[PDB]
Amino acid sequence: LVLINENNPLLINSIKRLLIGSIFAGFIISNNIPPMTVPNTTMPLYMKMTALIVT
Amino acid sequence: EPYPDDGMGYGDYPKLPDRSQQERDPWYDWDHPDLRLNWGEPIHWDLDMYIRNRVDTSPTPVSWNTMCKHLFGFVAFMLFMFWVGEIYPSYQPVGPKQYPYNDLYLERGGDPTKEPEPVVHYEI
Amino acid sequence: MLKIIIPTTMLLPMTWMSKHNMIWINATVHSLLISLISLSLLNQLGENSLNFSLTFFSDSLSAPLLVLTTWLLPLMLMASQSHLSKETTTRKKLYITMLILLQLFLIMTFTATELILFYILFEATLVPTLIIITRWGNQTERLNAGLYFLFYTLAGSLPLLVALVYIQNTTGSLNFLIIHYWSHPLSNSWSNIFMWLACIMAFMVKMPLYGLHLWLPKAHVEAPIAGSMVLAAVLLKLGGYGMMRITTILNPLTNYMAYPFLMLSMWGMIMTSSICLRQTDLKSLIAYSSVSHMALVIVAIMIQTPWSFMGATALMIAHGLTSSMLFCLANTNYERVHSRTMILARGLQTLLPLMATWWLVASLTNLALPPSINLIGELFIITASFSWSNITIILMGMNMMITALYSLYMLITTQRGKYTHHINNIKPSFTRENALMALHILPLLLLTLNPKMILGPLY
Amino acid sequence: PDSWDKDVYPEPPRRTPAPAPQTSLPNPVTYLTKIFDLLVDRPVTLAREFIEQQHAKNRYYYYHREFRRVPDITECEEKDILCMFEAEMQWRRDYKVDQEIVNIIQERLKACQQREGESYRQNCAKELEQFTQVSKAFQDRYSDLGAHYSARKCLAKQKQRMLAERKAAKEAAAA
Amino acid sequence: EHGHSKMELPDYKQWKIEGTPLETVQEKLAARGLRDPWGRNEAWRYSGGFANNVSFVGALLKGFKWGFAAFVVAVGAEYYLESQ
Amino acid sequence: SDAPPLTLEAIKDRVLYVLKLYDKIDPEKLSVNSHFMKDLGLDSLDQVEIIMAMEDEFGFEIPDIDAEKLMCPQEIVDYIADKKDVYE
Amino acid sequence: YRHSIFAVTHVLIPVWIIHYYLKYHVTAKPYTVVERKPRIFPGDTILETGEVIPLMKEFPDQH
Amino acid sequence: GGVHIEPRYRQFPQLTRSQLIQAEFFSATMWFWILWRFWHDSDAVLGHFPYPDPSQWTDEELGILPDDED
Amino acid sequence: CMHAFFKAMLFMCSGSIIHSLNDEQDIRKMGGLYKAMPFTTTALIIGSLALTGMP
Amino acid sequence: AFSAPAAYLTHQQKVLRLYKRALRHLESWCVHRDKYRYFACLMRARFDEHKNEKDMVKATQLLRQAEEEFWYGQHPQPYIFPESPGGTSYERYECYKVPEWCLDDWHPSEKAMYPDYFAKREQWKRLRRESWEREVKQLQEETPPGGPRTEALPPARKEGDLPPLWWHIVTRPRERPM
Amino acid sequence: SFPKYKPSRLATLPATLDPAEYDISPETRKAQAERLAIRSRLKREYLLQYNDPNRLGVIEDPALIRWTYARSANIYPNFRPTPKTSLLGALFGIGPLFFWYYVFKTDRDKKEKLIQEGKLDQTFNISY
Amino acid sequence: GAHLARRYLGDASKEPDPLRMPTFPPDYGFPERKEREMVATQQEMNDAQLMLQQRDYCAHYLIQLLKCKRDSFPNFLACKHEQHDWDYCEHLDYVKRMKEFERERRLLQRKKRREQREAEMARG
């Protein structure tokens, strides 16, 4: 008995707000606050990509 | 079978099996479905210990001894390896950070009337 | 003070000449009116005291206890209104007379500028309580409970009389002002050790201390509702009040004579908190909770630091109100159930929602939730004991965790779950019980706004 | 405001930068501040002016109580209960005054620490020194007295400290 | 307003093992000499719109084509506008 | 939730739909009152398999003591209706 | 209209009450509201005094 | 709040065009954002400053004397 | 701050699936929902890619 | 839950219960449908090869290593239906089931609403009042001396009679009262 | 062959792996019959007392009252002083008290000694 | 990483430890011994109140970045030249720290070589 249904404005709107958030808020907050930590400007290339490689 | 005639005051009370009360038949039509009890039946001396809200002796897929062995081994190995890694730390091939004004002497604690030994930094 | 003592005395002729169907109304109204009069005493000053006359004086330690004592009586009448329906007029009037006499004795006790008068009324508070317990009690064990309550108290308090008359013979006066101003150190000698023990044991037995608490569960279980609240709320504070009054002459001996009692209390708090977990009875569970809290108060008083005294007073008032509320709720459950067993009636929250709310609030307050005065007193005592020694924090934290555990166990077993099927006499809660719970709880949440009124003279 | 004296609660001149708009993009902060002023500060200010002008039509005063000085416990007889009572009350009042002094110093310390931002470790050295001195004096005066403190106990503590320091000084000089 | 429309169940003869990976199960059971009585009961899980499945990588790039087209258009517009 | 209020005829239709896809029994011979052990010659294990199939299809599971004594589609329908409190 | 009245009885009135309470009662006592002093950089001008902070010493700028 | 969708019983459920176009639009938006940021900001992942090789550093600037002076 | 956004997203999507599948939580009984629930699957995919650290 | 239990389970019942549990846990292990069907058929094959064994000593010798093998590979996290005694929503609605007798304590102002429901309620109460008097006698005369041996209750035999002890089975609150 | 499941106090033996119900004798069947008989007798009594329209109270349970009495009010009259009971009482009621007394006494002695030497750095310890 | 593997698998005394560095006088290498320059004084860095860990030799670019961010507030990505300059200066500081590490390593190498040569000459 298939009862699949999501056509409810409440669920769609609530999900889409957090969707826009999880897409853009990281960029906005990262670039819109004063720096508080010393940057890691220079790093080995193999260690620079370790997160992406392991993921 | 009563409790053994020891000093403790159990007296004449049946020693029901230490079998818990969560694992009674969940489909039987109990008189008290939440506690899984029947009206008039003898009550375990430690019912308040086994009420499905507390310790239960439900048989587990893995034996108790092997469960204890595996958990203790994992925790002890983790602690030992954390200590070993503490013995051999990990860092980067760099020298210590350099701060300009006498290692920031005035900004860390102060005491300006003491004239600390001045540390100079080596340009390279 | 006579503006308070005289109306309490006039309550007796007022009750005895009332109509047969209007005693409760008159007693409640005039008891509430008396409480309003007692409110004036709360405005203490940073200086010595409100020395009314040569016989009565009021401090900022006596003021909160006096206000609580005067406030409790209307609640006792509303609680006793239920099970005295089928009682003859003369016996109901005798019950109200016993309650009024108890209040009068407590009021005269808490000021009592002289120590011998304090002792006389402190033992006078024992007769109406014993009569109430042994006369209007349901179970057949009320007689043994009354005997235990009488003898445990009297055996401890009898050497106190000898100690007091000896002190009067040597010092020359027992007035508390003179005693405080002319205090001299107690040398380390066997005679002084036994004087210390005599002066302390009489108040430690009533608190009660762990190991001498056997009378309290019996007295609280077998007594009627009003006796239970007057025992848990005010009669337990007599020992602590006396100890904080009398420790002014036992220095510096206490500095090393407090070790056995400190160890006993700091271990008995854990023992009784653990006992509360495995309990088949509600009133017994509440009684053991009271024992744990009073053990904490004992530790605080024996530490003898300003924060200890402030926390002790706050905990005294808070525990009195909370224990009275819990006993009220247990009695309301027992009246419908007629069994007094924790697991016999379950899932009452589905049938009585507002009483479930009252249960939740009372359990949260007992759980020492911030910013209620329960946690204020708790935390003050914790910090003072930490200053005393850094290792006490282990015992105190263990006590806190076990207290939370047994409080929520009491809430969950009686409120949550599926209702018992074979009980069909759970009538909707009356307005009287809801009003009783509201009048119990609202003063606590109001006092959390003005803590300085219950923090004692060392504020 | 003149409600509190500025000398007891000192405050730096609180210099502030000037707006230097680098770009022509209008910042929302200024617009929001302007509208907030317009529809919040004006009604509040009018209500306060009305209340103040109502207060001015009925003005009366309250005075600060002044206490005479009385002989201390040092010049009080052995059993003279009246002089002992007066000295004890005076000592309690002095105790409360000292507590409020320590409270004032603590308030100044906290305010300076919060105000100075990330350079609090350097810019509030004077406040920390003042608090250290006042705390040491208070600890020497009133600490360890016990729950049943009294003028006699504080005097005994002072006498014991004076004996200890006199013995130390005599030993140092005679060495 | 609720779901009341008198829904009608489909015909039972529509569901067949044909075109589903239940052939492999049937064949390997027949090789050792048995059959699955309930084979048709689950044919509906492979018959209708559920027939076509998408790989994990293809699932991840759900909107790659539209996003790539928009990205190329935006980059070209920026190139032709900044060069001015 | 938005779950439609399933009725007796719907339950019977679903039961017969599940049974008719069980190829061990011919759809033409089966009836709502047909037995399992005698009228259709099904094994005990086969009956357990039908019970589990209805279990999976209806989303609720039948206790063994009640599942082992259901032998006709009509009484299966009645048991499901009693479980789910169906009026008509 | 619903939102118009909602923003009035739920937002505006609390703002008025809290602003009054902070402006004329909380700030009356000393040190109740303490603000971190704004950052001062080279080149800014102070409103209270008008003095100009001297600039940097022209550090060598390449890349 | 929504539209009437009826159960299917072993068929694919009804899909409105609104949800399909909305999901496609948001996935496209995410991928376009990722591509645009990677185009503009490549150093955030690949790095911007080369890692120096310590072996290539001559002993002149490292203050090393040829094993005889000191 | 970032984890708030995307983890709340993931839980909201899980709740949507649970409600749509008649209070079913075991993933053994969830099958083809990439086409049955397009907005939910796109939201969950975006949330998972954000969680794993997609650049 | 409905049916009363017997004093013991026969060998057939044990075999059937083991078969059901084994199939359930195999389905839990094999997530997909085709794999489940294949391995369920294989398990049925390996299950029926000892169907025709005659001696009971060897059959009891079997179904012991079978239980041990089941316990070794029991998938320590099996699939449980949401309403099962282990499910995620086992006793979710048990807090909404208010007993019928509570309606006897309603205020007359509350009873003013829903008058027809309370009229039917009075009719049901009268029916129960007479039926109980009949049922107590029927059960008294039907039970054997020495007390009942099993907890199975007899049906109604006469015309106007009703099954003994029916009130609290008929008036269950609901499956989902709210 | 498969690894054996070894039961413990907190993980009991499953009914399926238990061997008592596989060695079946007629007396075991008789025992099960008697158990079911007494259980059904109790159930019938409870159901007769439960469906009664005239009853408007709580069905008193003898088992619950017996359990409460055994737990609470029957401990002392059955108590006898034995070496096991005496040793357990002495240990569990004396050992913790003296242990904590020794710990706190040692800590306070160390603190007082440090105070007398003056090397404690009690600065800012105003409240006590 | 390789240096950690070399230190924890080869000879410990062969190459330094981060904690005790530097182990040689700054003037050992060359005698001119140029000094590092700081362009931000105590007072302006205090007014900018950056951080205690941010008050390093690259502070002036950080102050310029803060000024740029404060001035062009609404356009949060208006100023990136100074951000890149600060990153470049931090990169140069890291390069200098690497130079210090390698210098100490090679100095210790030559010290070990000198000690070995002296010991061999004495033995010979």
Ligand SMILES: CCCCCCCCCCCCCCCCC[C@@H](O)O[C@H](CO[C@H](O)CCCCCCCCCCCCCCC)COP(=O)(O)OCC[N+](C)(C)C
């Ligand atoms: C807008 C206003 C908001 C605040 C309102 C506050 C109202 C407070 C009312 C409650 C008062 C609490 C009772 C206080 C009793 C303590 C004081 C009392 O003992 O004083 C007595 C005096 O009490 C008053 O005369 C009588 C007050 C009793 C009634 C209080 C008001 C509320 C009564 C309500 C009763 C029921 C109302 C009707 C119900 C149907 C004796 O004073 P005395 O020792 O000589 O004074 C010597 C100093 N002198 C010379 C300067 C005077």
Ligand SMILES: CCCCCCCCCCCCCCCCC[C@@H](O)O[C@H](CO[C@H](O)CCCCCCCCCCCCCCC)COP(=O)(O)OCC[N+](C)(C)C
């Ligand atoms: C059971 C439930 C609780 C009830 C109440 C419990 C509290 C009562 C415990 C009494 C507190 C301590 C009593 C004595 C404290 C003094 C310190 C003494 O015990 O230690 C040594 C004393 O040595 C020995 O202890 C001598 C006393 C031995 C005899 C006493 C009985 C000991 C065990 C009895 C326990 C029974 C308690 C309950 C009775 C019913 C130190 O030797 P010394 O420095 O030279 O003398 C110090 C005193 N001076 C300075 C005045 C001279």
Ligand SMILES: CCCCCCCC/C=C\CCCCCCCC(=O)O[C@H](COC(=O)CCCCCCC/C=C/CCCCCCCC)COP(=O)(O)OCCN
């Ligand atoms: C719940 C049960 C609790 C029971 C409590 C009973 C124990 C109370 C403590 C002892 C009580 C008696 C103390 C005497 C009263 C104090 C009077 C006093 O201090 O005078 C002393 C006198 O001291 C005594 O006489 C004490 C004698 C004690 C005799 C009675 C013993 C009772 C039991 C003793 C042990 C109990 C201690 C622990 C009890 C714990 C609780 C069970 C000074 O003597 P002088 O003549 O002035 O000498 C000066 C010239 N050198």
Ligand SMILES: CCCCCCCCCCCC(=O)SCCNC(=O)CCNC(=O)[C@H](O)C(C)(C)COP(=O)(O)O
């Ligand atoms: C992943 C978990 C794996 C678990 C594996 C479990 C072990 C699998 C192997 C089990 C071995 C056996 O079959 S143990 C064999 C047990 N002994 C017998 O079966 C003898 C006679 N059987 C009967 O009489 C039954 O009733 C019967 C005819 C079956 C049905 O009857 P019905 O006509 O009433 O349906």
